[model samples]
Target: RRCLFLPLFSFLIVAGATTLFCLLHFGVIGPQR
Candidate 1:
């Protein structure tokens, strides 16, 4: 059970990080440039 939860938690962390990065780049960084 612990091992199974580890993979799911990692996936969510990566997905969320990528999403936040894209949003920042497009919505904030793009306008700044």
Candidate 2:
């Protein structure tokens, strides 16, 4: 029954983690130096 939303939910989690990694790599959330 949860199959329909599984893929979409998984994709969102992956995308969010990827974005978070990029932001951390670029220091976007760190000091504005």
Candidate No. with top lDDT: 1
lDDT of 2 by residue, 1-33 (tens): 678789989998999899777777787677643
Q: What would the C-alpha RMSD of candidate 1 be, to one decimal place?
A: 4.8
> Considering only N, C-alpha and C atoms within 3 Å, which residue pairs clash in candidate 1?
none
Query: Candidate 2: which pairs clash?
Result: none
Off by over 4 Å in 1: 1-5, 30-33
Top TM-score: which candidate number?
Answer: 1
Model 2 deviation from native, Cα RMSD in Å: 4.9
Please list the C-alpha lDDT of all candidates, in the order they appear: 0.82, 0.81
| Clash count, one per candidate | 0, 0
* All-Cα superposition RMSD per candidate: 4.8, 4.9
